Amino acid sequence: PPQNVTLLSQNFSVYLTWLPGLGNPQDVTYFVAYQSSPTRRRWREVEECAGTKELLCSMMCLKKQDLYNKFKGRVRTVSPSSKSPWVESEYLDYLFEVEPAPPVLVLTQTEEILSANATYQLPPCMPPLDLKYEVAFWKEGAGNKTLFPVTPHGQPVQITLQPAASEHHCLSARTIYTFSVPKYSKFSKPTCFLLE
Amino acid sequence: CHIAQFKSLSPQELQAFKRAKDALEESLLLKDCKCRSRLFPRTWDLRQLQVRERPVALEAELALTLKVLEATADTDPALGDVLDQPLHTLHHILSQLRACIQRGRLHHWLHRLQEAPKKESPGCLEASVTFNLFRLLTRDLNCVASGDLCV
Amino acid sequence: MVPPPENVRMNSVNFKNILQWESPAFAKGQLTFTAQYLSYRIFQDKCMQTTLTECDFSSLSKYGDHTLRVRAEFADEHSDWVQITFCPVDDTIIGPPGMQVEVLADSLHMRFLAPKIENEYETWTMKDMYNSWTYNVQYWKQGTDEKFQITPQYDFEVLRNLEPRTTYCVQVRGFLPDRNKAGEWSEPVCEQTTH
Ligand SMILES: *[C@@H]1O[C@H](CO)[C@@H](O)[C@H](O)[C@H]1NC(C)=O
Ligand SMILES: *[C@@H]1O[C@H](CO)[C@@H](O)[C@H](O)[C@H]1NC(C)=O
């Protein structure tokens, strides 16, 4: 049986992660199922993850899954000749434990103005969440980073640009998801180039 | 209609609802919550109903939620203090929803909602209204407040 | 009978709800004031036996109406209930947004920062509380006192076609067209455009 099984959340989605058993052979295979807090009797099995050897399974959206109540998952190692007991993870409430991903910045340089939009690869079945993005802007070689106010998702960030050209400017964006308390994300990798 | 303001609730209000939901769930651990029929679980979503029918569907669900939670609060004082602010907010939302609305799926849903209190145990009713609270406040209320935008 | 509090009002800027009253004259000694809010159907109590003439009600729900009450007590005896009604959604006073104006040659670039709510978080500002929120910008050249009004669609705006070597003063305020409610103007910031 897997030693540490964790139901974690990242990139707006939920995953179940385990590790191989200490004595488990190399031909080890894993089967995973999930249950919801409202219904403790049902233990519906994940079809896409059934028979997987990948130590990682995705439980983002499954049949008859409720993301508005906490749910848990279990995983077992199924040998070709034996089956191990199910190992259940902890309950995960999606609306309060979802880790947002950094946004994808789209840059458009209008005359004396730089517009930075944020685009998101949200899951199709994700609940409607409040997503806002803060934009840090700076010059290469200097630690002075100007941090702009949070902007709602679907609205661009307009940065005033000086007439000066042939300069190294870089941008990054951080997602702030707010349901009851703000959860921040890591700043996106700085994708930057020469302007004007 | 001034319901558009309920598209998103203040995080402080959502914190209060979370506290109430946790307290209600803890009480449910002891009570026997078995339902003759899963009335609250809704197979269809308000989106499937016409924009005009979405409010009346939510109003009936919200009225049941309020009624069951009101009784639970009166029965247990320990739940009364934590459920007070949630109940106040829910009643205000209910008043706006009613003041907003001047056979099919909707008729059966309304009949089932009306007959549920007189045929189901109070414990399972309060369990159903508890586990549907954020479903109603984040998925339904948002679509109803959104109006034509929700599709 | 000890006198009730006088001039009981609720000043609430950016949902910073504060109940204020004036302590009535009483030569017997200092008066202790208790305040309560009608939560649902029962009157819950804050600011119990508060020597101060001020109570904080910012913890109140921001949705729906509330009924507040304050009274004064000296030892066993107490005053009468002084009851007011507070509706945070519309009774609140919209504060002035922060202003960041930069002169860029012959133009002004202004960025407006939404009035923050201390009870809420930096993500939840007064822009998200009111879905119909918009910004009104009023600018004028110094001396002429001829105001010009614009309504930016977002929190950033550019004023162009400005005379060179000339100083203009600008203000910004939040507005709610669906209810015709306007916040207080920001302090006029005056900036010079040169070459
Ligand atoms: C499981 O986690 C523990 C830490 O408590 C660690 O010692 C152990 O190595 C982990 N299991 C595996 C297979 O790495
Ligand atoms: C910014 O992106 C959002 C979606 O990510 C889009 O709805 C909006 O129109 C964009 N604004 C622009 C391109 O100015």
Author numbering:
A (entry chain B): 6 to 201
B (entry chain C): 4 to 105, 115 to 163
C (entry chain A): 20 to 214
Original authors' sentences:
Further investigation, though, revealed that they are functionally interferons (IFNs) with distinct roles in mucosal and innate immunity. While predicted to be structurally similar to IFNλ1-3, IFNλ4 shares only 28% amino acid sequence identity with its closest relative IFNλ3 and has a distinct biochemical composition resulting in IFNλ4 being one of the most positively-charged known cytokines (pI = 11.3). We next use protein engineering to overcome the affinity limitation for structural determination of the ternary IFNλ cytokine-receptor complex and determine the 72 kilodalton (kDa) structures of IFNλ4 as well as IFNλ3 in complex with IFNλR1 and an affinity-matured IL10Rβ via cryogenic electron microscopy (cryoEM).
Through extensive optimization of sample preparation, we successfully determined both ternary complexes using single-particle analysis to final resolutions of 3.26 Å for IFNλ4 and 3.00 Å for IFNλ3. B The structure of the IFNλ3 (blue) ternary complex solved in parallel with the IFNλ4 complex provides a frame of reference for differences in receptor engagement of IFNλR1 and IL10Rβ-A3. Overall, the structures of the IFNλ4:IFNλR1:IL10Rβ-A3 and IFNλ3:IFNλR1:IL10Rβ-A3 complexes are similar to the previously solved ternary complex of an engineered, high-affinity IFNλ3 (H11) with IFNλR1 and IL10Rβ27. IFNλ3 and IFNλ4 make extensive contact with IFNλR1 and highlight the ability of the receptor to engage with basic residues, most notably Asp98 on IFNλR1 interacting with Arg47 of IFNλ4 and Lys21 of IFNλ3, which find themselves at similar locations and forming similar polar contacts at the interface. The importance of the hydrophobic residue network on IL10Rβ has been extensively described and consists of the Tyr59 residue in Loop 2, Tyr82 in Loop 3, and Tyr140 and Trp143 in Loop 527,36–39. Tyr82 engages spatially similar areas of IFNλ4 and IFNλ3 and in both cases is almost completely buried at the interface (>97%) but due to the differences in their surface charges, Tyr82 with IFNλ4 forms a hydrogen bond with the backbone nitrogen of Glu36 instead of the multiple hydrogen bonds formed with Ser11 and Ser13 on IFNλ3. Tyr59 in the IFNλ3 structure shares two hydrogen bonds with the ligand at Glu73 and Asp87, whereas there are no polar contacts shared with IFNλ4, indicating that the latter interaction is more hydrophobic in nature.
